[PDB]
Design an enzyme around this catalytic site. Sequence first.
Site, PDB file in Angstrom:
ATOM      1  N   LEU A 282       0.839  -1.022  -0.142  1.00  0.00           N
ATOM      2  CA  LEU A 282       0.097   0.090   0.160  1.00  0.00           C
ATOM      3  C   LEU A 282       0.997   1.104   0.027  1.00  0.00           C
ATOM      4  CD1 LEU A 282      -2.988  -0.753  -0.098  1.00  0.00           C
ATOM      5  CD2 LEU A 282      -1.757  -2.328   1.514  1.00  0.00           C
TER       6      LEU A 282
ATOM      7  N   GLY B 206       5.124  -5.946  -8.246  1.00  0.00           N
ATOM      8  CA  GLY B 206       4.615  -7.157  -8.492  1.00  0.00           C
ATOM      9  C   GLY B 206       2.942  -6.774  -8.773  1.00  0.00           C
ATOM     10  N   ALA B 207       2.107  -6.395  -7.821  1.00  0.00           N
ATOM     11  CA  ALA B 207       0.939  -5.933  -8.058  1.00  0.00           C
ATOM     12  C   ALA B 207       0.579  -5.113  -8.992  1.00  0.00           C
ATOM     13  CB  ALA B 207       0.305  -5.587  -6.646  1.00  0.00           C
TER      14      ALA B 207
ATOM     15  N   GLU C 237      11.414  -7.053  -5.508  1.00  0.00           N
ATOM     16  CA  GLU C 237      10.859  -6.449  -4.556  1.00  0.00           C
ATOM     17  C   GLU C 237      10.209  -7.547  -3.310  1.00  0.00           C
ATOM     18  OE1 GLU C 237       7.754  -3.577  -5.093  1.00  0.00           O
ATOM     19  OE2 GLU C 237       9.150  -2.064  -4.916  1.00  0.00           O
TER      20      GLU C 237
ATOM     21  N   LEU D 107      14.110   2.535 -21.812  1.00  0.00           N
ATOM     22  CA  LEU D 107      14.720   3.694 -22.066  1.00  0.00           C
ATOM     23  C   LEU D 107      13.867   4.819 -21.477  1.00  0.00           C
ATOM     24  CD1 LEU D 107      16.339   2.542 -25.397  1.00  0.00           C
ATOM     25  CD2 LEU D 107      17.205   1.952 -23.197  1.00  0.00           C
ATOM     26  N   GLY D 108      12.988   4.741 -20.921  1.00  0.00           N
ATOM     27  CA  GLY D 108      12.043   5.760 -20.411  1.00  0.00           C
ATOM     28  C   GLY D 108      11.406   6.295 -21.867  1.00  0.00           C
TER      29      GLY D 108
ATOM     30  N   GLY E 242       7.152   1.680 -15.903  1.00  0.00           N
ATOM     31  CA  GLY E 242       7.928   0.412 -16.241  1.00  0.00           C
ATOM     32  C   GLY E 242       7.147  -0.885 -15.723  1.00  0.00           C
ATOM     33  N   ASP E 243       6.122  -0.749 -14.771  1.00  0.00           N
ATOM     34  CA  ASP E 243       5.446  -1.815 -14.427  1.00  0.00           C
ATOM     35  C   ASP E 243       4.346  -1.882 -15.360  1.00  0.00           C
ATOM     36  OD1 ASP E 243       6.812  -2.223 -12.017  1.00  0.00           O
ATOM     37  OD2 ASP E 243       5.905  -0.953 -10.935  1.00  0.00           O
TER      38      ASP E 243
HETATM   39  N1  ATP Z   1       8.418  10.725 -20.738  1.00  0.00           N
HETATM   40  C1  ATP Z   1       7.924   9.395 -21.562  1.00  0.00           C
HETATM   41  N2  ATP Z   1       7.433   9.595 -22.468  1.00  0.00           N
HETATM   42  C2  ATP Z   1       6.987   8.532 -23.115  1.00  0.00           C
HETATM   43  N3  ATP Z   1       7.100   7.356 -22.809  1.00  0.00           N
HETATM   44  C3  ATP Z   1       7.528   7.021 -21.629  1.00  0.00           C
HETATM   45  C4  ATP Z   1       8.200   8.180 -20.713  1.00  0.00           C
HETATM   46  N4  ATP Z   1       8.605   7.600 -19.638  1.00  0.00           N
HETATM   47  C5  ATP Z   1       8.345   6.457 -19.627  1.00  0.00           C
HETATM   48  N5  ATP Z   1       7.813   5.900 -20.913  1.00  0.00           N
HETATM   49  C6  ATP Z   1       7.421   4.565 -20.960  1.00  0.00           C
HETATM   50  O1  ATP Z   1       7.405   3.897 -20.093  1.00  0.00           O
HETATM   51  C7  ATP Z   1       8.406   2.749 -20.255  1.00  0.00           C
HETATM   52  C8  ATP Z   1       9.230   2.566 -18.976  1.00  0.00           C
HETATM   53  O2  ATP Z   1       9.899   3.817 -18.649  1.00  0.00           O
HETATM   54  P1  ATP Z   1      11.090   3.587 -17.573  1.00  0.00           P
HETATM   55  O3  ATP Z   1      12.158   2.997 -18.651  1.00  0.00           O
HETATM   56  O4  ATP Z   1      11.322   4.935 -17.134  1.00  0.00           O
HETATM   57  O5  ATP Z   1      10.819   2.407 -16.802  1.00  0.00           O
HETATM   58  P2  ATP Z   1      11.422   2.018 -15.165  1.00  0.00           P
HETATM   59  O6  ATP Z   1      13.082   2.480 -15.085  1.00  0.00           O
HETATM   60  O7  ATP Z   1      11.245   0.731 -15.115  1.00  0.00           O
HETATM   61  O8  ATP Z   1      10.414   2.916 -14.380  1.00  0.00           O
HETATM   62  P3  ATP Z   1       9.370   4.076 -14.614  1.00  0.00           P
HETATM   63  O9  ATP Z   1       9.196   4.243 -16.222  1.00  0.00           O
HETATM   64  O10 ATP Z   1       8.220   3.884 -13.789  1.00  0.00           O
HETATM   65  O11 ATP Z   1      10.068   5.539 -14.333  1.00  0.00           O
HETATM   66  C9  ATP Z   1       9.318   3.347 -21.394  1.00  0.00           C
HETATM   67  O12 ATP Z   1       9.950   2.343 -22.060  1.00  0.00           O
HETATM   68  C10 ATP Z   1       7.989   3.949 -22.160  1.00  0.00           C
HETATM   69  O13 ATP Z   1       7.347   2.929 -22.878  1.00  0.00           O
END
Ligand code: ATP
Lengths: 327, 327
Positions: free
Chosen positions: B24, B53-54, B158, B244-245, B275-276
């Site tokens: 939570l 996980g959730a 986790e 790659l964000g 990412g999840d």
């Molecule tokens: N600013 C953004 N614009 C577009 N897509 C994004 C952005 N940030 C994240 N994403 C999307 O989310 C996915 C996961 O992002 P990221 O690699 O940042 O994951 P993480 O390090 O596991 O944690 P989180 O994304 O939750 O910060 C990316 O591969 C992309 O699909």
Amino acid sequence: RARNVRSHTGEYAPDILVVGSCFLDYVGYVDHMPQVGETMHSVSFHKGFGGKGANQAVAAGRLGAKVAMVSMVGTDGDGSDYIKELERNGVDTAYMFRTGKSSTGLAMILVDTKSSNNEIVICPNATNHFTPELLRAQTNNYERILHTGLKYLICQNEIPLPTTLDTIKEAHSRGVYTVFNSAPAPKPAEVEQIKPFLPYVSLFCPNEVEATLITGVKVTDTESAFSAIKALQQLGVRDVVITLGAAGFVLSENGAEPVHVTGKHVKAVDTTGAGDCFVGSMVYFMSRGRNLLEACKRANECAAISVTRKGTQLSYPHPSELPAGVM
Amino acid sequence: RARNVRSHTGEYAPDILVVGSCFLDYVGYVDHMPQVGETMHSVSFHKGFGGKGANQAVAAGRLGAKVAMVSMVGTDGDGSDYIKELERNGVDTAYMFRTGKSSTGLAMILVDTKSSNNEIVICPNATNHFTPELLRAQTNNYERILHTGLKYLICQNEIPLPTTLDTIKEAHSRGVYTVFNSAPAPKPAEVEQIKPFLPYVSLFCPNEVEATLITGVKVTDTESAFSAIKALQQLGVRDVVITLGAAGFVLSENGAEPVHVTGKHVKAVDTTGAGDCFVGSMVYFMSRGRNLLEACKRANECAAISVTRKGTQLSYPHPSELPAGVM
Ligand SMILES: Nc1ncnc2c1ncn2[C@@H]1O[C@H](COP(=O)(O)OP(=O)(O)OP(=O)(O)O)[C@@H](O)[C@H]1O
Ligand SMILES: Nc1ncnc2c1ncn2[C@@H]1O[C@H](COP(=O)(O)OP(=O)(O)OP(=O)(O)O)[C@@H](O)[C@H]1O
Ligand SMILES: [Cl-]
Ligand SMILES: [Cl-]
Ligand SMILES: [Cl-]
Ligand SMILES: [Cl-]
Ligand SMILES: [Cl-]
Ligand SMILES: [Cl-]
Ligand SMILES: [Cl-]
Ligand code: NA
Ligand code: NA
Ligand code: NA
Ligand code: NA
Ligand code: NA
Ligand code: NA
Ligand code: NA
């Protein structure tokens, strides 16, 4: 329904009504306080049951009080956990209100045991919506909770102030003995709003800081506490008790000569919630027919036992622990 | 029983098993971060459902996955709330374990909106007891949860690492496709223990940092990410995806020439849980019969959409909400 149910005839109606706060205490023990931007793990965690309202009800309930808690919690599981906890500590929950729009009130507490420092963020949550209008709407303008059998109301300053003040006034108008523990300490605009209500307060039970803020007497000791009592009687309070921590309490019953009773000599380990224990215990002893002085001496003993253990509600005594003649 | 019940005939057995964390999220919004010794009020509060996980199970469940969550929560109300929330997000809860000795895991999260800075204290609580020996004891040494017909396993980092590694190994040995998202980033000692289990990881799906810490290959961009991919094939991983964000992802299917798909251009409001969302979505699409690249392309779109709204799980799309051509 985790909550109790009231009967048509009122066979289980309480002697003592607590209208106040219920907060879960989420305690994360940490190796250091987090800096800005930091994600860390705790080294330990503890979930406690707090809120001054609930603390006072449970202090009373653990001694066997016919006490009922009137408050607001969420429909969340935290709310259900509290409602059950109250029952297991002898507190009737029929008039606990549950909102789907707010989480249960809670405090997020970080504790560095090495440095013994805390950081606390108070999240009143559902409590902020526990308004007089809602209370009136749910209780037929207080009729459901202020039945003729009711001997005592206890309020604090941990719910919307109008709820506290309006409840005090209505209960007092019905001949209920009203107890007001103005904790946490009232802010300057709260003090201004409180003072016109003091004539409806049977028993005003502040600590030294709170007496200071309310009266303008700098309370630091027995003699200044006695001056504070006088100012409080001038503002229309019938009975005054000022708690003085390790120095015990002072009181005057209905303008009589003020009395000082010193603190018990005990090993203070953790005074958290000791005040709530004092207030709740005090009122239970009054419901058993003790006069104010008898009641406060016994409360003073209960609060002293509480001070010797950690855990806030977990440190509040059961009857078995009390010396002969207290119960 | 809030939890789901299995049939004797396995008629509800899932396609995707998630063995990981449920936390939570206690989110307190504050005017400023508390200083050492400070007690303050929040400005508001938000109760959320988290744990990687959730989060991943819910990302998949929201898109219609036949997903089941395996985790440990308390017998407390938070536990019960999580179990119901999972069900409301299309996740089977028959293998959610509950302990009366521990609270449900939680994160205490303070957020300064002004600065958008956060302080987070993670309290795994029950999660710390989610061990391989418990898991085995409750599942007939994994037989109850790793039926023939289970297609995918998702694990993160986790819960106790040995639970993660042992589950991945058992699942892989039964011909389950294993997905391992090494979040939060594995510590040096974790990396040492993970490396010998990478042959049992069908798909390793880290972010830049997590790929860095595992291969030694520093990852900042596409060129390096491809190096890291080769490095992970070398360590025994069949399929490799690196997110790659805003730059989308890179991947290689079973040792093929890598591919970069760039990020969707969206207004990132809140990337928490993105990412999840990617991982859970990716697996859902693979469960529907798409190949890794088609799955990841759609997961990329889902995660992009999630980033446009606050709320973590609440920002994860449902099918009716997606633009045409994603499902
Ligand atoms: N600013 C953004 N614009 C577009 N897509 C994004 C952005 N940030 C994240 N994403 C999307 O989310 C996915 C996961 O992002 P990221 O690699 O940042 O994951 P993480 O390090 O596991 O944690 P989180 O994304 O939750 O910060 C990316 O591969 C992309 O699909
Ligand atoms: N060190 C102590 N030794 C003995 N008794 C104590 C001590 N501290 C507190 N008490 C008991 O608890 C009662 C309340 O203490 P105090 O006036 O400190 O309450 P508060 O300011 O309302 O809050 P708290 O005591 O919970 O910090 C005292 O009147 C006394 O009975
Ligand atoms: Cl209820
Ligand atoms: Cl407690
Ligand atoms: Cl709330
Ligand atoms: Cl259950
Ligand atoms: Cl949520
Ligand atoms: Cl715990
Ligand atoms: Cl939603
Ligand atoms: Na009792
Ligand atoms: Na009782
Ligand atoms: Na209600
Ligand atoms: Na104590
Ligand atoms: Na569904
Ligand atoms: Na589902
Ligand atoms: Na989001």
